[PDB]
Structure formats: C-alpha cells, structure tokens
C-alpha cells in the first residue's frame, strides 16, 4: 500500500503551467549540518505573476544526509492553497524519475540501496498528508541518481492570482566504497556494500566492525531477528549505550523501524580519539550472533 507505484502515471516538470525550462526559478536547499531542507511554505502562494515554476535543487555528495521537504497543507491558510496537489502521493517511498522528458513513478528503495525512510517525522506521519517528508541517504552510493517530487499549487486561484508549481530535484553523486561492518546474509547489492558478510548456515568469523575516528559503521541484521543489544546496551572489555560511551556519536535507525532495509549505521566523530573495545549481540527466533566493535585500535 505505502509502496504502490502506478506504472501508467506520467507528468512533466512544467506540468500544465506552460512555463519553459529556461524560466524556472531554480534555487538550492537550506543546508544545515547534514539536513538539506526544501521549504515551500512561502514559495507557492498565489501571485500576480503566477503560475511560476520553483525548482529546489538538492545536491548530495556526502554520506548520511537527511532530506526534509515541507509542502504547505490544504487549509493551513484559507484560500491560498485550496487546490494544492503533491506528487507522488506515496512519497517518499515513491519518487519520480525522468524517462524521455517524462516523469514516472519509481520506488526510491530500488534506486538507492540502504536508504532509510522513517515511518514518522517529528512524531507525525512521514507523508505529505502531514505536510512534511524525510529520508536519510546511505553512507555509500555507487551510481548517480536523480529523482523528483512535486508540490503543485498552480491550480489554486484567488481573484486574478494563481499559485506556483514546486519541484524538488534530488541529485545524488557517487560517494563511498563499502561500509565498515557486517551484513548477515542468507542480491549482489547486499554482498558488495559491507566489508564483511556473515552467512547463516556455516560461519567461521563472527561480526567484527573495526572503526576509527571519522569512520562510518553499519550492520545489516538478519531478516529473522528477535532483539538486539547492539548500540544501546554495549559491553566494554577495557553509560552502556554507544551514545553514552562516545560523546556526540550518532546512530541511524535506532528503532529499526525503517522499511525495506533492516540496518542501522554509526558515525564515530572525528574528535573522538580514545580507544574502545565493545560487544553486543543479535538474537534470532528459530541461536544468536556475537558482534565485536573496536574503535581506534
């Protein structure tokens, strides 16, 4: 349901606005730390000059960037957004890619392996129905990607004024090679993204992700998983969560609720220079797997 694509859907960047591509009002996202934001609250109001096309360019060449997109909701202000529309309606699970000057629906998870889509944004649903959508990009991207969202207010009319059509284009350039960590496996995508693979039937080497200051770690957890003490209750062999052990580290997908990819990532800060040797575990339902994390050995 949330991930349902319509293969027959077609649109264009300009939509039905009659604006040629040379006349788009292009601008960049408001980038702060690792959060790139395209806010349309003030951009799409009905204007005399409208309909104008306003394109927000999200250019990503770094890992673990979070993209927030704010699209004003119908009725947030009376009359000004009465006929607003957003595309795809199943964003961010569904995005638009350019195929022959045409935009068609594609699953974002198949475009970028490892992409984290949380179910909630600020404890509201992660859907344009709540006005905001978010997704975190992975620590590794191999092929360049370009996908689009639409937040179109051009059909809204107020006296002689008309709203504007909003376009967000996310441009991901390649970055990274492999993720320091382990993939518990049963595609080639699962095998090539992590430095160590752990097979279920006959394993010799348990999970050993070796981190240093500035490095990114990750774990692809087994599909069948009961619980894990990994990154919240860790055992030093030299304040038990990794956050408490490494001040200002960040763990992505703490709650393991992201769709598709059962992964969480860790970022060791460049400041952190002390040495640490930790243990956590992964429980299956059916045995359990041991995880050894070393930092700055």
């Amino acid at each position: 349901e949330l991930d349902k694509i319509d293969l027959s859907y077609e649109t264009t960047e300009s939509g039905d606005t009659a604006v040629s591509e040379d006349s788009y009002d292009k601008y960049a996202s408001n980038n702060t730390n690792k959060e790139y934001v395209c806010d349309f609250t003030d951009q799409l109001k009905p204007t005399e000059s409208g309909p104008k096309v306003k394109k927000c360019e999200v250019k990503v060449n770094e890992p673990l960037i979070k993209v927030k997109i704010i699209c004003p909701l119908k009725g947030s202000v009376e009359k000004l957004y009465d006929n607003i529309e957003y595309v795809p309606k199943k964003s961010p699970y569904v995005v638009l890619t350019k195929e022959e000057t045409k935009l068609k629906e594609k699953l974002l998870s198949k475009l970028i392996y490892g992409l984290l889509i949380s179910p909630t944004v600020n404890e509201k649903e992660n859907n344009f129905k709540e006005g905001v959508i978010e997704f975190t990009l992975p620590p590794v991207v191999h092929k360049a990607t370009v996908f689009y969202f639409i937040c179109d207010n051009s059909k809204t009319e107020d006296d002689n004024k008309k709203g504007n059509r909003g376009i967000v284009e996310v441009y991901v350039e390649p970055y990274g090679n492999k993720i320091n960590g382990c993939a518990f496996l049963d595609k080639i995508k699962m095998k090539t993204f992590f430095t160590q693979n752990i097979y279920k039937k006959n394993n010799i080497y348990p999970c050993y992700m070796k981190l240093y200051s500035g490095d990114i770690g990750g774990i692809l957890f087994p599909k069948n998983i009961k619980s894990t003490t990994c990154f919240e209750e860790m055992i030093p062999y030299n304040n038990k969560s990794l956050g408490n052990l490494v001040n200002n580290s960040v763990v992505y997908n703490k709650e393991m609720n992201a769709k598709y990819f059962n992964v969480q990532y860790v970022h060791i800060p460049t400041s952190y220079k002390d040495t640490l040797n930790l243990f956590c575990s992964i429980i299956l339902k059916e045995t359990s797997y041991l995880v050894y994390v070393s930092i700055n050995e």
Epitope: E21, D22, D25, K26, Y27, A28, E57, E169
Partner: single-chain antibody, 234 residues
Framework: QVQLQQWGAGLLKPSETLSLTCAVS????????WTWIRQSPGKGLEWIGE???????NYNPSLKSRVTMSVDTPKNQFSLNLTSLTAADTAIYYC????????????????????WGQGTLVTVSSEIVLTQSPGTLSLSPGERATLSCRAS???????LAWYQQKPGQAPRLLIF???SRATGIPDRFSGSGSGTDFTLTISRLEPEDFAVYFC?????????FGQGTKVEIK
C-alpha cells in the same frame, strides 16, 4: 526581471591584471552557474569559467593557468581575475547566468547561458568543435533562412543551444535542447538535429531578424561556441 550589473577597469597595460565583478538581482544566487564569457575579434566567443554559490569552479583549460574566480554570496556577486595580460585578451567580457542543471550524462551540465550581461570592453595597450555553415546569408524579408552547426564529435542527448546577437548587443537565447523555443521567442524560429548535425530555421525573415547566430554545446566541458553565421539583406 533578471538583471546582471557588471563593472571593472577596462583600460589596462600588458602584463597587468584584469578584475571584473558582476552583481545579480531578480534571481537566486544559489542554483545557477555564474560564468564569464569573452568575445574577441577574430577568435570569437570563448567560455572562460563558471562558479556557484559554494565556491566550486570550472575553468577553460586554455585560460586555466591565468583565470581565478570567486563569489561573495552575501552580496550576490561573483568576480573574475585574468592575469599576465596580452593584446590577445582584448575583447568584450560578458557576465552570464548559466542554467547549471544536473544531468546523468557525465561531463555534461544543462548549461546554456541566458541572460547575458551588457558587456565590458577590456583593452590591453599602453574539445568539441562546432563549425557553422554558411558564414553569411544574404536574403530579403519574407524568405527562409537555414543555418547549420556541425560538431566534431557527437553531442550527447540534444544538448545544444542557439543564440541571436543583434548588432551592438549581447547575445540572447533562442533555442535550448536543439529544438525548444525559449520564453518570448516567436514560432518562426525552429531548431532541429541530433548527434553531430543541427540546423536553425528562420521561416519568414523580418527586418530585425538580421543578426549573428551562434550554436553552443553543453555536452562536454569546456562549453564551446560556433564561429557565427551573419544574416544580412540582399
């Protein structure tokens, strides 16, 4: 209402340093590639380099040694510094707004230049090659003009633009994507072609349509122009 104010010292001795600055208004300084372009007598149109709001640069390999560009994003300005000046650097320098659109084609950028600045004459005194044919068309009003632009190597996609330069003015964009009319461009201007062969067709000439027409490719950096085709009366 995109305006590009341009200023800088124009009368310089050899070996001195040229410094031009351009100020943007009516457009968001983020989201375009602010470029410099010069038009020299004989040499023709030449792309110098580009810079965005983040400070990232791309320079022409020919001028790469002597060219430096900067941005002062607060004031929405960007600047050029050409060094080791010679007489061959005498030309009209244009501030220009490059579209700067992203493409999955490598080495390519959707980077036709529109609008251009008014131009600054700099006087020194004390690759994909596009070949346009003809060099000169002599025709009367109401007749059809057909111009050709041929590239030394295939232009990926249809990443070609055409420009019109009326006498005494800066170029203005006519066509982008080989065959897409720009905003405010009459229907009598039609573009066509793909690969290495492109044409610009002016179906029913009118007295002001007598200008110089250039093609530009943005499929492989450095962005290059044709030598021009002059359209005149007969």
């Amino acid at each position: 209402q995109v305006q590009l104010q341009q200023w800088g010292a124009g009368l310089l001795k050899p070996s001195e340093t040229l410094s031009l600055t351009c100020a943007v208004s009516g457009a968001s300084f983020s989201g375009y590639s602010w470029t410099w372009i010069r038009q020299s007598p004989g040499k023709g149109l030449e792309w110098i380099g580009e810079i965005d709001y983040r400070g990232s640069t791309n320079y022409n390999p020919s001028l790469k040694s002597r060219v430096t560009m900067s941005v002062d994003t607060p004031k929405n300005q960007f600047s050029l510094n050409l060094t080791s000046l010679t007489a061959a650097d005498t030309a009209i320098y244009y501030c220009a707004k490059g579209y700067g659109g992203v493409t999955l084609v490598r080495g390519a950028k959707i980077n036709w230049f529109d609008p251009w600045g008014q131009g600054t004459l700099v006087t020194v005194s004390s690759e994909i090659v596009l070949t346009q044919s003809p060099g000169t068309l002599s025709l009367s009003p109401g007749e059809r003009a057909t111009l050709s632009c041929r590239a030394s190597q295939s232009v990926t996609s249809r990443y070609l633009a055409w420009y019109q330069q009326k006498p005494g003015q800066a170029p203005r964009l006519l066509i982008f994507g080989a065959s897409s009319r720009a905003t405010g461009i009459p229907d009598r201007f039609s573009g066509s072609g793909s690969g290495t062969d492109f044409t610009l067709t002016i179906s029913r000439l009118e007295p002001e349509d007598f200008a110089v027409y250039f093609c530009q490719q943005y499929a492989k950096s450095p962005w290059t122009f044709g030598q021009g085709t002059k359209v005149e009366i007969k």
